[PDB]
Symmetry: C2
Subunit: 483 residues, 2 copies
């Protein structure tokens, strides 16, 4: 078979149908095996290699002449061998964790359809799903009858960038033709705990990171409303022009939620666009129990929401929602057609990301997403309640998690009663993490923040993570902490 | 089975392995069937429905309660039913056409791995493939030993946007902190035949579409070098600052190639960044026979290249290549680590697109891509030679295609000897196109350009398209043109 086959033998080659059905099914068998193992707790989360080791371990170089299909199937096998098992019960390293089965099936179909999003003409079903999916999301947000507008973007960082583009265009439509030189000095405001995409977006948009002012946060990670007003008032005293405040509904580290009702009030007072970065926190909008954390989002001019994070949609499902209909097109256009849409965004070519969200929503219902969001949040509560009362574990800030983010230090037995042992604590998480990966038992991110030294930022979003996996984690950290 | 199953029954559920293997395989069977039919010439390219018809034809709405897996498999079946068959031999509607079997297999695996690109830590193999794939592309471009830098972007439109960001940052690194208000008035230059992403990028970057000057093109679609110099000289006479010239290597309509050696010389003379938009034309760099069309690309500061177009990589494979190493990081950063990479681009989250290109390159070799690029170009020559000498067919410009783009009018027998029958010709392509879709036999794009009225822009990039399919097309157009 495959040893005497090549790509040129497969469809659209005439003697191609039989070898194609076999080859694709053999890839599928590899994929299925990896899928089941991903859920097996005896499987390593990571088979860790240094870049040079991985380079020397296998030939990854490219060649002039073609390789046979046996060698291609081996490449697939080898690739999944060294891949991180992002669906594994004990993978806790990023905000996006898990491997959703309907979502995967939906992604497989999307690739098979392999079309662009720009017109109804070539993506008729997908343009319609995009309209229905984004409308429902606008209802969940709280905009009356789901009114407003929306787009899927290639990342919430770009969704944030779009929101800033549109807030500027709204205040100064002439920027499009004339550039920033035509405008007064624009100022944007965001929290000290907010995502770096806002500074990056401003730099990209010719606004300048100097014109992105950071607002002070409290001990719990929440933007202080009175520092925001103070800063707005300073800006317009200097004759600068506030155009944007970006509030974060679920920060990346603490999982903190800015007080939306108070910033909404400040944005009402000063006539400023309110954006909500709900990339991470947006999932809690599916929870009747937890959505109160996003109270005031209904007053926002724009919202960013990443179903690829808490809702488990396979990678790249990010939406921007804008309340004022027509704005996005006006901003982005350069010159039944209502289904294009092409001149609403910066992208030209655009990958179909809607179907994976829509099929999952269909398979799970709104209630399904709800139940999952709550399962994760309780599990974080289970973690928080154990370590809160456990010797060797000190919380990074006082206040219960908002959110599945649990931030903590592990203090090894050889450091607890030491009479600036912070310097030694600073080095504990990096060593544990290193040992986690060498053994491949779990993965957790650690980082410093402000005046805090390297601490573990535990996060839960994987449906495969259970109470035992939290129990295992606590114990593994202890085991690996010597010293 | 599936009638009494739900998503909650599948992995990671404990009684989940058996129903998961069955469900995923049943989706796969649907996908395989659609794949084989895509190559069957008796299959319709499109089952055309108006948006309202499609909405009424099937319930696409979302619900609170979950649906069973039988209903989910039907959704998959229904979705592929109304999908355009972008792999079909007679699909000619866009620049991206075809369904590559290794590429599809590679895409299926990528989804299964479901990881982010931002660090070696979670995408160890994929970060390494990205380094090797982009280096080879830099060699093919002509940069010595493949020196330089590169990134995959979510579309060549964003790659174009990145190039403009970086050309600006290179001339005025202070823009990052201070914004466009700190700078002199920047001017960018591009051809009348160039892609709209350059104006869109400038508007986004706060540069202003007023500061994107369009350079005159000749009858064959190529930028006139002396209008470029004329325009550059006017800009600096007014004390404006030329920062960018974007030359197009393969325009979207004519498939024209700007004269790179002459613009390179102008960019050398005036000390201006040279970008090459080779999104479409980049494939010809794989052809020893055809690469001379891109002579001078080796002198470019940046190049955009979309393997998802002519090379047949499934949707979203776009690269930006930059000759000066370190520039991209310096531009994008806000503050063995060499494998991150995260602060090189605007995106945070980033989808893995490298593996589909790398596996295909492995399966085909450089020679494979070469042979395919030539197969398409000859087929376009076959089209051009038939219609050039065929009654009823008038070429849109004089000069042989550059390129698989063939631009033409069909003049129905009831218009040929008419003594301003252009007004009636203006309406022929829209009617034919409409009839093409109602019958579902083929799809071709038509458009006006400048002083030319609606003409067909035929394009070839699909490996499944043969001589018979061109023959069919000629005849179908004739059949449908009455009147």
């Amino acid at each position: 078979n495959y040893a005497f086959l090549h790509a040129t033998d497969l469809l659209p080659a005439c003697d191609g149908e039989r070898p194609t059905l076999a080859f694709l099914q053999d890839v599928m068998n590899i994929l299925l095996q990896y899928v089941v193992k991903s859920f097996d707790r005896s499987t390593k989360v990571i088979d860790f290699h240094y870049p040079n080791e991985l380079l020397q371990e296998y030939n990854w170089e490219l060649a002039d002449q073609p390789q046979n299909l046996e060698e291609i199937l081996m490449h697939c096998q080898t690739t999944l061998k060294y891949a991180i098992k992002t669906g594994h019960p004990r993978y806790f390293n990023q905000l996006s964790t898990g491997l959703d089965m309907v979502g995967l099936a939906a992604d497989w179909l999307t690739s098979t359809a392999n079309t662009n999003m720009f017109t109804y003409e070539i993506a008729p079903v997908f343009v319609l799903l995009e309209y229905v999916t984004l409308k429902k999301m606008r209802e969940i947000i709280g905009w009356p009858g789901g009114s407003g507008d929306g787009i899927f973007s290639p990342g919430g960082a770009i969704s944030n960038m779009y929101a800033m583009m549109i807030a500027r265009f709204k205040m100064f439509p002439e920027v499009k033709e004339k550039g920033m030189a035509a405008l007064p000095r624009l100022i944007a405001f965001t929290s000290e705990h907010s995502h770096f995409s806002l500074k990056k977006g401003a730099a990209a948009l010719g606004i300048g990171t100097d014109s992105v002012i950071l607002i002070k946060c409290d001990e719990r990670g929440k933007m202080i409303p009175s520092d925001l007003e103070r800063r707005i008032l300073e800006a317009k005293q200097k004759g600068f022009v506030p155009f944007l405040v970006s509030a974060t509904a679920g920060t990346t580290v603490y999982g903190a939620f800015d007080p939306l009702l108070a910033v909404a009030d400040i944005c009402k007072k000063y006539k400023i666009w309110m954006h909500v970065d709900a990339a991470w926190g947006g999932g809690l909008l599916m929870s009747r129990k937890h959505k109160w954390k996003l109270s005031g989002v209904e007053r926002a001019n724009s919202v960013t929401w990443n179903p690829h994070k808490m809702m488990g949609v396979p990678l790249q499902c990010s939406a921007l929602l804008v309340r004022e209909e027509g704005l996005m097109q006006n901003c982005n256009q350069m010159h039944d057609l209502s289904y294009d849409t092409g001149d609403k965004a910066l992208q030209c070519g655009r990958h179909v990301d809607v179907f994976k969200l829509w099929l999952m929503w269909r398979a799970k219902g709104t209630t399904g997403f709800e139940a999952h969001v709550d399962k994760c949040l309780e599990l974080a509560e289970y973690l928080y309640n154990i370590i809160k009362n456990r010797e060797g574990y000190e919380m990074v800030f006082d206040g219960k998690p908002q959110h599945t983010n649990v931030c903590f230090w592990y203090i090894p037995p050889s450091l607890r009663t030491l009479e600036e042992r912070m310097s030694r604590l600073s080095k504990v998480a990096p060593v544990i993490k290193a040992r986690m990966m060498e053994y491949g038992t779990t993965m957790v991110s650690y980082q410093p923040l402000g005046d805090k030294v390297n601490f573990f930022r535990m996060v839960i979003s994987n449906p495969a993570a259970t109470h035992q996996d939290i129990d295992f984690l606590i114990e593994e950290i202890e085991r690996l902490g010597q010293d």
